[PDB]
């Protein structure tokens, strides 16, 4: 039972996820860091 | 996905179409949207469709359309007076909506194939309503509705119309007023109590025309049978005393050691009861 | 014990760092040890470089106080939960915030990142927990179970994803794709307020008022019971090393073995220097990524860096 | 009657519902219209009352207490056995439940079942008290036995000098005097050098005054005593007394070197 | 090829003793005895259970279908006159069809009288009818199959 | 998965426990659907 | 307005336990 | 001979202990011993869940449990492989359920589909005379235009077993 009811806030944004770089500070540096 | 069905509505035809919606119409019990279902019975049919949620089907063990029994094609009202009232459900508004909840998650956990607390009940049967179950199809149930036109004399579409052209039923009879909620939950339905007034007719269990008589007149045997039928048929009810036989007339009298057994054979037996594929009519004296 | 086991150097406390105007209530460390990040009751989050304790950049957004702060690992994100009922992403590309969550009715006490899904769990006061679709903002499940508030969820990757406690004392297991409870645990008579999961055992630990108990994992068979220093506690965080640290509201804090439960230390730290002896104890506490510094974040508006001792035995 | 009783019931009923729904918890309101469904001898509803009141608050160990009284008012034996076992499995450690239980299934005449019972209770490790009702239950037949078996199990459950004591002093009782001095052998074996005190080591040294081993009573005292601890001081001094007394029941040596 | 009399069933519920019809029919009676004595149904379960019907056991799989003679395979029916179901306790073997047989073997809980075409009575039994009774209790599902595991665990044929 | 073993009839008794509705294959209350 | 004093509200029949509730039913006033 | 319970070649209804020779519909739900032990009285607690979903019940789940060593076999993060499998498999569910809430923002079906059909009440003049039917599936096409039909906004009480909790001097008081 769902309604057709919308609301402004809700429509899509920012559907890209920013995956972290290399320099930003990638996991994979992490690991190997001391 | 697909409905839960009487053999008389789906349809005398093998090959059927049938179309779908997704929320169709509310139910007209819990009221809800469900999955609704058309197809055409048959040549001059009506194109039935779901009336109820497949839910309360389950709870109450009955097809959409009808609301009759999957097993006996009986009014509800009928099957409960022939086995358990204490099934219940709430009628009243907000309950109705809350017990269908639960029911709805408690049926949700169930292998799926089964009407709940009923089934452990349902199996055990046979009392009358067996008797008084039908046993072929009806199909005068899916006629088309009677053209309201033409029964105040004026219908201009001829031989062409649909509907159906006939007197309709006199609004006295009782048997008219019909309401669907009321059908459903068991209350002064109307057919339910004919069929209720036609078991008590059926001849059968008052039998007690003596005390202590265990004598069975047994009416229609024929030559072809032995005793040996009668007795591995009745050792299953206790000490016998004895078996008295006559093929002149093919009459048959039987004598038990308590008259409880000898209700008991008639109950088990009256126009019931065939062996050696030959009807053994069964009296009292 | 086992033999008098695993000898532990004392930590002395090494700093203290002024300089929020409410209590700090949450402590987060970067990825790369690089910053570390506060939440507080004056409705800002504060980034700290971890080094020299000077303070790099104050955040404004919440509309109340701070409750929760988490710095993703695969993505330059800091989410942040409040008393406001407001969840929102900050993207620390440009110092904003690029989404907000929406849907808990009360003060969100907790949150966390699963590590490897991009999915987002929240407590809150009005007794549901929720898994938020990091990427589309959307509540994948709601987390019915307890009676009471949420206080404090764990995230994992293996199996119960999901492990959260609460006010009404019990524990409850969910998991994750089902959004329903495998295990309930009841085994503590007050709040659960904390709970953590040790790095290479896979056990898990919960604190309450009355004692700390360790679980085996899955379904949370009894373990050990640590008992010692009885106070509301708050916090509870591990080191690799095995290091149990013990917060409570009373301001004592206590470290414990691990694997014995031998409270080798107890520290009990001077309130600020104007303040009141009332306002301490550690609301949180964190360890930066080399294991060497522990963090505490506390009543009297501080936060205190402690260092391992050198000298020791 | 007929319509008249009726509003009544719909008025009184109405606020029912309308109290608990203001208040949803505050079970004294739930309980109230429970008591009063069940006054009106519709004990369908009632069960249904106590059954919501229950989802609210399942804890609340009054709230159960009132259901399962309930039904045992209106002789729904096996109502009452249902909701008892209810009780006892989500709420273990109350022990109003399981005395209650049990005195339900005694008053019915079900031994049996009350001794399943007890053997699940016991499973809990529970208090002292609950052990000692355990057997005097067992003691209200002759079941001697089964009562040394259950002593056998609670003095290790609770392996407290007394419980060793009391049991030991339960085998006097009946005369088994054999088995009551092998207790005793077994406590101070089981406590050891280690721990052990006054009161069991004077308790024994009754026992043997009793049997009229007075030699023995001395080696008892003498020996146990040089073996352990002894000088703390007040049991010492308690121990002496009793040894004084034995000894009662040229001499007055120990009178001049105490003084010295 | 002994004919020994009693049967012994050490269940997980209770233990109970049977008297083998040698009598009557000695060939399921000798398939019976020593499939006991090779311990082939320790550790089965009674899968079927029919209230006021019947408990059907005799399958190492477990599943209905499964289980095999000492004969190899099915073998003959021994259908005698003297052998009807009536009364509780009777002990025969379970057959899909005529004049073969597998182990699996069944109990009564009651007269039966429909069922003397279909199958050969191996015997009676002796001692545990309380065990038959509380094993017909238990709690099955929708295909009388129960919902807990009743099992045999030691049978032995003593003669 | 042989036809030995596959098709191999259920072993022995029939349990009249069930209504000739109640002995019938089904994945759907009123029948078996597929 | 029925959902009182026609109809049991909402009803939960207690679930049943190793023992018979069949037999009893209960007096009028 | 006997007559009574205490004591096939009989040819006598004899019922020996306590098997019911008429119809009492008892509400009891079977004791039950398994294997070896115990009345299964925890059968209680399950009775409205099934089998396969656990419910802590009986005093040993409550005691603990010693040891297991620095590590065994029987404590560890399933694996690097079940973690993916197990990841994957929730990523594809998801993302189907996902789709579906996402329909409403993102505001066209042809399939024909057949199913074969077993009825339950057969009886050889039911249909006309066959086992089975087969009845074509077809979605019904809704009108792009239609506003929503009926009302959601409807709203009834939450719905209600407790696990076992397991867990004063007058001065204090
Ligand atoms: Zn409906
Ligand atoms: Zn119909
Ligand atoms: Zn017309």
New binding site residues.
Partial sequence: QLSKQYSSRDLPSHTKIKYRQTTQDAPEEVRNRD | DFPILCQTCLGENPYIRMTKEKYGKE?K????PFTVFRWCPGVRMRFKKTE??Q??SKLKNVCQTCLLDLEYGLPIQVRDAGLSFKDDMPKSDVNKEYY?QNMEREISNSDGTRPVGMLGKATSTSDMLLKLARTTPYYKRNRPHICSFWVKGECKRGEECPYRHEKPTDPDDPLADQNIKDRYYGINDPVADKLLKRASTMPRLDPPEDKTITTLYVGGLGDTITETDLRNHFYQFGEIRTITVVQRQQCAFIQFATRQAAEVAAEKSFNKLIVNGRRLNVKWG | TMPKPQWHPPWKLYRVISGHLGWVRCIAVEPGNQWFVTGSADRTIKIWDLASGKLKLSLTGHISTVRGVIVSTRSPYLFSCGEDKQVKCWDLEYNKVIRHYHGHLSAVYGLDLHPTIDVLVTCSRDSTARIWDVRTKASVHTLSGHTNAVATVRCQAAEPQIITGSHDTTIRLWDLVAGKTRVTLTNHKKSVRAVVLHPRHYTFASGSPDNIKQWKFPDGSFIQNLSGHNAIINTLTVNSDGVLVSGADNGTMHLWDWRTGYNFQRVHAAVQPGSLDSESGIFACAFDQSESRLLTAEADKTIKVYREDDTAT | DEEELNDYKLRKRKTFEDNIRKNRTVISNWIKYAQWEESLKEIQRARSIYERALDVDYRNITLWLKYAEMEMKNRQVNHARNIWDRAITTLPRVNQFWYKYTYMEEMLGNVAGARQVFERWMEWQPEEQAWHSYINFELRYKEVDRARTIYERFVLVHPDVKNWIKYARFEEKHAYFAHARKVYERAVEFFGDEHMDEHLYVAFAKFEENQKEFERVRVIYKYALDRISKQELFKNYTIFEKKFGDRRGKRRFQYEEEVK | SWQPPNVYLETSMGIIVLELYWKHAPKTCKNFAELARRGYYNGTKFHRIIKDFMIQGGDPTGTGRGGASIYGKQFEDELHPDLKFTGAGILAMANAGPDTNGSQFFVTLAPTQWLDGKHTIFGRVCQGIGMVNRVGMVETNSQDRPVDDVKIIKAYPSG | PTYETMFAPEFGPENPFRTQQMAAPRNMLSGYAE | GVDYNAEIPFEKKPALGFYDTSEENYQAL | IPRLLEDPEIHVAQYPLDMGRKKKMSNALAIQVDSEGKIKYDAIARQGQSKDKVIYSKYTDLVPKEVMNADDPDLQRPDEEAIKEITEKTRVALEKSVSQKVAAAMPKLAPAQYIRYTPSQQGVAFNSGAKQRVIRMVEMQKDPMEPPRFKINKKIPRGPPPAPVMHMTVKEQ
Wanted: charged share 10%.
């Fill in positions: 139910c019990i819990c009221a809800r109820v949620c839910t309360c269908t």
